[PDB]
Design a binder for these strands. Structure first.
Lengths: 766, 24, 154
DNA sequence: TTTTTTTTTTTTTTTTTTTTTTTGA
């Protein structure tokens, strides 16, 4: 209870600064006019673009990752007007989890959705036009023009789409006597940037510098077309950027269309841009607008903490540190051997290394004999696409397999796409629908804690747990809360159906060894006594579309099971509670990996969450029209009807089985400024969470970690990121000692935090 | 395996007819 | 062979519904009782099966596992020219490693084979005519009735 | 003996509802 105290009393100065930062009116002339964004649309190339200042404010919340910086965000949300966003979908869901654990937070989306990022922008040439900054000292106008030229192929499209959409909106209400506060409510589906000027971007170090200006730019857009009351009040955006500046980095990928060499360079993140740019540190006044959270809560060690301090603050590496980290070094052939460290996540510094490691363990488990099962993943290229693109690349000679030499990464979610063991691509022309299709096999493991990568639609088919676990679900109605408060009737219908379907399970437990004849006699006798105040008999299920029905018909079934669970719980003591209770709406038989959910009826249709830790179960086919929302896309929809698409089944933390949909992703990049839908990749998009790259590890914390370090490529920032993903130093093993080997340390942002920790106007929260 | 019988095959011979092809 | 959902309203007991979960062969014994009642004892559990030499299959498809073979089989039933094996999984084809001898010749030594339990024996007709036509399948012409008569002595 | 070439994130619009089983040469 005393843990929150420091945050509780130190976030108040933060709150008492963001308020004046958000309630500061700009001069009339400094407000970006609508005509500005009209001219931006007219401009074709980002060269004649006029030097235009877009005013903004910042407030920086830095601090160790997992330093509980979210308490500050929590206090901000419940006190201030704010639009909470996230740099990654995982981070956005993590903030939602930690904001709805205290009060109500509206669905937290990504900043990309907030400024209008759509599908076609994903693969867009974001680094093309040049800029010779008339700078040193770099004017803010020049920096903003650089960040708009960087994102010309995104800023221009956003401006054009927003502008050419037409005017009503707030313009209408404002003239009530010529009430815009009640305008976003009455006029719905309006962009969330029209109702607040405090934009919280969490884990903002995962965003490049180009985005910062972009966000501000977009803010003004969405407040100019709609003529928001904030625009009439001459308010300016304030970007509360929350993230770890020394545990997070942003990378830019460019693909050269002749060499087929996809390159990824390092970039300046928003945090580093704001901390280390003399122009932004003055305009935004970071000295009076910086909060550093300094405590590592999860950590409960002492020497582990000192090492984190020296690595994060750039302190000199001493002999004692070398001797401490010496106790973690385990051989190269010990980490890579799958027989060792079971259940420990293994980090490598190369995607090829992860592709090697995942394959060897697959062989190990398969030979030793979970189940190493094989599941189809396909691809769909088209003849016209690879005809025209080959024409435009100045090289019309290129084989399709050579097309898939590197664009397989750039055809779907990169993370799992380049970190999966898979077969040989069977690229066969299926031009029936004018197409050429590929076919490989992404072997998984059976019954492992896998994670959903992309956005999937979960369809819960039932619960495979214990009688006690299902009694708990009904008692607290936790399941109902996961579906949201606006549509509770749908959640109550399916639970009702389950209870009327799971009555047979009690009768199987009736056949349990070690029970007296009269013990079972009293069992069935109390079953009869409860039927007297209720045997399945012939209960009439179902209800009309009425709110009262799901609070009367369900109320009976909820009380029926609750009682029934608790009834036999007392009769058989702990044995009944631990007994496995499986409830499904259909005859579900699961021999080996293959499952069979018969014919679905879409009793409860929901959306799987990426953060939710699921468990791989098996690939039932049971073609559901719920996932078959297929409408190019129809040409492959016909083939998906042809070849039965397998729907992989996952088990959530509670234990409810959920059948999910597949994933489809486009590749559109070109060089002739002709973005055309080339290839759509149909696969599963699940990750093992057992092996990954250090760079991706930055995003999410891990329980047990074994780090495989490649010598020569040793960057102390990578070592710090890898070693900081786990709370306890006890469960940490490593290839070599990053402190004892030659390491390229880049301690430039470290001294900047140190000078920030050495400034009277910077607020440090313990 | 979950099986609840409370949650069959069609006879493909003429049990009834009301119209046919009168040849005689 | 009967399809589970086609017989979902049948309300059968255990062993008589899980055998036909995807589709399952049923050995129906037709006959009379001594009092003249026409009975049709629907026998369950009988599966058609064949053998392939263990080393030969291990080589020609690196089937480093009995189930790795089942995957190659279902991959073939997916690539099937016309969509007769929809949904087929790695569990319709249970397999084990048996220690049998080819009847041909006396010098023959008892090798290691895989005994591959098909269900729905038309899939065995495919997996016998189209699966790796350079490996030698042994008893893939023996229908499920003969497996029923022979496997049960008497 | 030179000798490489490492990592990431974003891509929405909704919650139910018409089933089919010999093919080849």
């Amino acid at each position: 209870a005393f843990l929150n105290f420091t945050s509780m009393h130190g976030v108040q100065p933060i709150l008492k600064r963001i308020r004046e930062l958000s309630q500061q009116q700009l001069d009339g002339a400094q407000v970006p006019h609508l005509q500005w964004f009209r001219d931006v649309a007219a401009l074709e190339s980002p060269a004649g673009l006029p030097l235009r200042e877009f005013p903004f404010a910042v407030y920086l919340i830095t601090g160790n990752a997992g330093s509980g910086k979210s308490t500050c965000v929590q206090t901000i949300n419940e006190v201030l007007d704010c639009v909470v966003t996230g740099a990654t979908r995982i981070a956005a869901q993590n903030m939602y989890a930690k904001l709805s654990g205290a009060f109500l937070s509206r669905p937290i989306n990504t900043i990309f959705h907030e400024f209008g990022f759509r599908g076609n922008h994903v693969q867009a040439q974001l680094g093309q036009y040049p800029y010779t900054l008339t700078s040193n000292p770099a004017s803010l106008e020049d920096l903003q023009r650089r960040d708009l030229t960087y994102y010309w192929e995104v800023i221009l499209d956003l401006t054009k789409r927003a502008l050419a959409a037409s005017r009503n909106e707030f313009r209408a209400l404002a003239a009530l006597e010529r009430l815009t506060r009640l305008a976003p409510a009455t006029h719905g589906a309006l962009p969330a940037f029209t109702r607040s000027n405090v934009i919280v971007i969490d884990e903002a170090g995962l965003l490049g510098r180009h985005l910062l200006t972009a966000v501000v730019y977009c803010w003004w857009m969405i407040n100019a077309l709609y003529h928001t009351p904030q625009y009439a009040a001459r308010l300016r955006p304030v970007l509360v950027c929350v993230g770890s500046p020394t545990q997070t980095a942003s990378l830019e990928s460019t693909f050269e269309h002749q060499k087929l060499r996809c390159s990824v360079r390092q970039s300046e993140n928003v945090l580093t841009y704001l901390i280390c740019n003399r122009t932004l540190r003055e305009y935004a006044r970071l000295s009076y607008s910086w909060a550093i959270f300094i405590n590592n809560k999860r950590c409960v060690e002492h020497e582990f903490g000192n090492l984190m301090k020296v690595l994060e603050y750039g302190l000199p590496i001493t002999e004692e540190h070398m001797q401490f980290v010496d106790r973690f070094v385990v051989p190269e052939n010990y980490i890579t051997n799958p027989a060792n460290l079971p259940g420990w996540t293994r980090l490598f510094s190369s995607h090829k290394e992860v592709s090697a490691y995942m394959a060897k363990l697959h062989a190990y488990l398969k030979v030793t004999r979970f189940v190493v099962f094989t599941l189809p993943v396909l691809t769909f290229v088209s003849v016209k696409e690879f005809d025209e693109y080959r024409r435009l690349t100045h090289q019309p000679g290129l084989t399709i397999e050579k097309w898939l030499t590197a664009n397989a990464s750039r055809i779907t979610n990169y993370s799992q796409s380049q970190d999966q063991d898979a077969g040989h691509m069977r690229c066969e022309v299926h031009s029936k629908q004018q197409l050429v299709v590929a076919r490989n096999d992404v072997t998984y493991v059976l019954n492992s804690q896998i994670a959903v990568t992309a956005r999937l639609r979960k369809l819960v088919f039932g619960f495979s747990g214990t009688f006690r676990a299902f009694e708990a679900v009904l008692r607290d109605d936790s399941f109902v809360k996961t579906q949201g408060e606006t549509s509770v009737e749908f959640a109550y219908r399916f639970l009702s159906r389950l209870i009327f379907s799971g009555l047979i399970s009690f009768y199987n437990f009736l056949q349990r060894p070690g029970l007296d004849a009269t013990q079972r006699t009293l069992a069935y006798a109390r079953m009869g006594e409860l039927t007297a105040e209720i045997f399945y008999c012939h209960y009439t299920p179902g209800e009309p579309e009425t709110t009262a029905a799901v609070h009367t018909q369900f109320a009976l079934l909820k009380r029926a099971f609750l009682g029934r669970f608790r009834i036999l719980q007392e009769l058989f003591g702990e044995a009944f509670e631990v007994a496995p209770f499986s409830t499904y709406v259909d005859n579900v038989i699961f021999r080996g990996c293959e499952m069979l959910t018969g014919s679905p009826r879409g009793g409860l249709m929901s959306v799987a969450l990426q953060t939710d830790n699921y468990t791989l179960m098996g690939y039932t086919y049971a073609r559901v029209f719920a996932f078959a929302d297929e409408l190019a896309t129809a040409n492959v929809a016909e083939l998906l009807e042809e070849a039965p698409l397998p729907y992989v089944v996952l088990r959530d933390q509670h234990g409810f089985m959920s059948v999910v949909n597949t994933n489809i992703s486009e590749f559109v990049e070109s060089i002739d400024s002709t973005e055309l839908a080339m290839a759509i990749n149909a696969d599963y998009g699940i990750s093992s969470k057992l092996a990954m790259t250090i760079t991706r590890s930055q995003g999410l914390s891990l329980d047990k970690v074994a780090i495989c370090f490649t010598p020569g490529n040793l960057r102390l920032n990578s070592a710090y990121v890898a070693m900081s993903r786990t709370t306890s130093s006890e469960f940490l093993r490593m290839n070599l000692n990053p402190l004892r080997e030659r390491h390229e340390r880049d301690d430039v942002i470290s001294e900047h935090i140190l000078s920030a920790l050495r400034d009277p106007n910077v607020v440090i929260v313990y | 395996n979950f099986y609840n019988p409370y949650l069959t095959q069609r006879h493909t011979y003429y049990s009834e007819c009301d119209e046919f092809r009168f040849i005689a | 062979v009967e399809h589970a959902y086609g017989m979902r309203a049948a309300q059968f007991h255990a062993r008589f519904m899980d055998a036909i979960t995807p589709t399952g062969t049923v050995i129906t014994l037709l006959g009379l009782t001594p009092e003249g009642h026409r009975v049709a004892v629907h026998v369950y559990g009988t599966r058609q099966y064949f053998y392939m030499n263990k080393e030969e299959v291990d080589r020609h498809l690196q089937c480093r596992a009995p189930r790795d073979l089942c995957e190659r089989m279902a991959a073939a039933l997916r690539e099937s020219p016309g969509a007769s094996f929809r949904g087929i999984s790695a569990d319709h084809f249970e397999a084990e490693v048996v220690e049998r001898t080819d009847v041909y010749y006396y010098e023959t030594r008892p090798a290691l084979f895989y005994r591959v339990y098909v269900r729905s024996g038309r899939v065995l007709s495919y997996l016998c005519d189209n699966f790796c036509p350079a490996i030698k399948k042994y008893e893939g012409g023996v229908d499920a009735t003969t497996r029923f008569i022979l496997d049960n002595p008497g």
